[PDB]
């Protein structure tokens, strides 16, 4: 599925999102853009071999499970494939634990080159919310 940005926004926020772990909405909103371009089904290969799923580009490296990852973990206890569905709820609730780790939402590589330190309100500027 390739979400509208305030249809991505709605269910993100549905999904409690909004100012988890002090981050606002626009953030997860801007990290799905330029992660998978809001599209459910994105996947893009690591060079470590590692693969990274969904709206959200989460990886097999420790969040899920893909049977292709040697040494990897799955800490989200899911099928990377679940990440991949139209239903973003597994994505959500993945997030939410891959954001409580440690470093935020620095663990999304193009949040913090793309959207930290920007204005990320704009990504949900016009949306029924």
């Given at each position: 599925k390739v979400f509208g940005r305030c249809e991505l926004a709605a269910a993100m926020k549905r999904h409690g999102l909004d100012n988890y772990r002090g981050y606002s909405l626009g953030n997860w909103v801007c990290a799905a853009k330029f992660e998978?371009?809001?599209?459910?089904?994105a996947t893009n290969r690591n060079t470590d071999g590692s693969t990274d799923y969904g709206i959200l580009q989460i990886?097999?490296?420790?969040?899920?499970?893909?049977?292709?990852?040697?040494?990897?973990?799955n800490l989200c206890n899911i099928?990377?494939?679940?990440?991949?569905?139209?239903?973003?709820t597994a994505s959500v609730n993945c997030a939410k634990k891959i954001v409580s780790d440690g470093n935020g939402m620095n663990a999304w590589v193009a949040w913090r080159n793309?959207?930290?330190?920007?204005?990320?309100?704009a990504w949900i500027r016009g949306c029924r919310l």
């Open positions: 998978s371009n809001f599209n459910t089904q990886n097999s490296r420790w969040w899920c499970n893909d049977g292709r990852t040697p040494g990897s973990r099928p990377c494939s679940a990440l991949l569905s139209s239903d973003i793309r959207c930290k330190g920007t204005d990320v309100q």
